[PDB]
Nucleic acid binder design. Structure first.
Ligand code: AGS
Ligand code: AGS
Ligand code: MG
Ligand code: MG
Lengths: 333, 78, 333
DNA sequence: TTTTTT
């Protein structure tokens, strides 16, 4: 009785909204293919495991923050390289003005196809980001050090002039203008952020991130990356041990953490990730300090086993296939 | 238990809110911690600090949350 | 004499108003059934008790705000699922463009029947909401993060352009245009808002909400939801201990609070709520860490008692019935 | 109305 005219009114309203605002203005969530979450590999298998969905979600905003020299620009360059290897166009809005193009190729980035922008002001940086998103031809954009996103008023002003929350206002406005553009264009945006200690820490941890509060709400994935040791081959430090704690996740379960190695001039040690990932998965046998595979004793120590896996590509493919088979909770293909 | 709350003189309370804040925190502890003598001393100092004497880490976390709620309900209680 | 003339004039005026504006333009408050308050369950029993009237008032505006990852979206999705389980039709205006359909499905939401819209502009968002409210076929509309309700001029403008209170003006206009429609259709509108910092305030709460002041005035129920701790199964963090503070209430006594758990992938832990509320009502006995029900020792720890409740559906329904009878301040007809 | 900063 009443349910039929209720359905009629619902259909009429849906049609009128479709006419007023467009074909995809309103529809049932089940039949909206654009809302499906698509992820891309971050270049780190352990990080893809920790992220739950297998990587960073396309068309969302990602905040990655950590202390000085924690490897944030290296992790973001690695995910840029991973996206480029699939065939995507990438852009690097380098606000902090220190991207080494030679180290970027070393981390696997196609420098010839990486759109590079050194924005003068924070407003110019975010406007370039908005233009790239609205274009739809850029799949990954990385904004380095939103601390360096200096407002035009702050730049035109003098050092020591107080600019009340102006950077926070700009950041919130950019989020407002950019969330929809990124969703429509299916473009991933990665904000590298810094840690700032606060004064008088009575109700919280000192480690604040600059750029206001809007980035915390709008970021789909928030990564806390830190350096937790040194990878020294002999007496020479040839790498760094890093840990990433997923502090906010809107595409899978948060608070997971991934431990890996950045090896200076090579990036994330992917085979190093593979060794440990197989070890925790019982496919790689850890006999004290020995590493053996299917009875075949592959080495001693983590570095020697990683080198041995580098020596044997077919077994690396096989172990990678198995680890992806069981550990990825949402295998896309 | 001994609670010392030091408030930066560069970021002072409204005039007369120091004693009110002390009494209000005292009410909060005696509600949360009735078994022990909760004495709060709020005072102006160089930096804002909270010192808990006679309690564990979980208790210190509880007192920090209580002070947070007091500071943010200042309008309710002052 | 005089009183008879007063009654005659009153009856004539009421009849005139009814012919001019309609049958239900004016009447005595006691005989106006449209003025009664109807509530819909939140999906959280403790919050239902904290709301006084047993749920969110249907046909009103509701604001839910809190910090990042405090559970605003999940709480609103549980409300939507509870409404849909009663045969009602719900709509989700995603201004954040940050909804996961799979997670919404895992929370119990009928994805194939939930109306979902990703509006480009805040004006488009509120116009779609207005059309749905005017239709009368949608019962619960949830507008995600009015912080993302970006004015059309702001979208057309550039990052860094000053739009002084344009969002506030648009929100004020929308409330004026929407309160009457929501009351007429008896449809509940739930607004999610984000917490921003107001600066220059050295005492009190600097936690302002976005969207201006009109939301504060027009919202019948205002909730401060905050993640106050972690729920972990030893090492892995499986959920969040959260508190909801009823900071404004037009249908019951305000300033009450509720405490519960959101388990990642399951939503509000209804069984944990039932265990806790039975504990408060002297129905579940706590000997230290030992939960026992009517002599029988149901479990050790909140998780064990919750599992025991899960494995005894009859007992769970029994305690649900008696708790609902006991603690609800306003027992609905 | 709008936003922290060390
Ligand atoms: N061109 C390079 N060649 C070799 N190693 C490098 C180079 N650039 C950086 N590294 C090292 O790689 C590790 C992490 O890389 P980075 O990209 O510098 O991380 P980061 O946290 O972004 O540091 P910032 O941006 O300066 S605070 C650091 O230990 C660096 O010393
Ligand atoms: N797809 C998902 N998979 C697993 N966990 C999730 C997912 N989405 C949200 N959660 C978790 O559920 C808890 C509540 O999340 P939400 O309700 O989405 O947060 P929120 O309060 O809306 O704050 P926002 O919108 O993220 S700024 C958080 O701890 C989330 O990490
Ligand atoms: Mg850098
Ligand atoms: Mg949300």
């Amino acid at each position: 009785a009443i349910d039929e005219n209720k359905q009629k009114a619902l259909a009429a309203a849906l049609g009128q909204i479709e006419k007023q605002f467009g074909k995809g203005s309103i529809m049932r969530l089940g039949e909206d293919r654009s809302m499906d979450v698509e992820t891309i590999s971050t270049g780190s298998l352990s990080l893809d495991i920790a992220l739950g969905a297998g990587g960073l979600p396309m068309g969302r905003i990602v905040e990655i923050y950590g202390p000085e020299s924690s490897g944030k620009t290296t992790l973001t360059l690695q995910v840029i390289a991973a996206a480029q290897r699939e065939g995507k166009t990438c852009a690097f809005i380098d606000a902090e003005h220190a991207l080494d193009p030679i180290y970027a190729r070393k981390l696997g980035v196609d420098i010839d196809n990486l759109l590079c922008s050194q924005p003068d002001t924070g407003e110019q940086a975010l406007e370039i980001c908005d233009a790239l998103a609205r274009s739809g031809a850029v799949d990954v954009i990385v904004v380095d050090s939103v601390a360096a996103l200096t407002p035009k008023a702050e730049i035109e002003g003098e050092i020591g002039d107080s600019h009340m929350g102006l950077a926070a206002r700009m950041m919130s406005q950019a989020m407002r203008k950019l969330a929809g553009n990124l969703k429509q264009s299916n473009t991933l945006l990665i904000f590298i952020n810094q840690i700032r200690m606060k004064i008088g820490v009575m109700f919280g941890n000192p480690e604040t991130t600059t750029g206001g509060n809007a980035l915390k709400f709008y970021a789909s994935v928030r990564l806390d990356i830190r350096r937790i040791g040194a990878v020294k081959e002999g007496e020479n430090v040839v790498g760094s041990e890093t840990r990433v704690k997923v502090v906010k996740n809107k595409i899978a379960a948060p608070f997971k953490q991934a431990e890996f190695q950045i090896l200076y001039g090579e990036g994330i040690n992917f085979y190093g990730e593979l060794v440990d990932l197989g070890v925790k998965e019982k496919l790689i046998e850890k006999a004290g300090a020995w590493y053996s595979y299917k009875g075949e004793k592959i080495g001693q120590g983590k570095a020697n086993a990683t080198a041995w896996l580098k020596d044997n590509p077919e077994t690396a493919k096989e172990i990678e296939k198995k680890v992806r088979e069981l550990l990825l909770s949402n295998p896309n293909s | 238990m001994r609670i010392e709350v030091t408030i930066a003189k560069t970021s002072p309370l409204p005039a007369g809110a120091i004693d009110a804040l002390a009494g209000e925190l005292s009410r909060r502890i005696q509600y949360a911690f009735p078994d022990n003598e909760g004495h709060v001393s709020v005072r102006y100092a160089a930096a804002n600090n909270l010192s808990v004497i006679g309690a564990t880490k979980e208790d210190k976390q509880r007192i920090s949350e209580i002070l947070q709620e007091t500071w943010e309900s200042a309008d309710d209680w002052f």
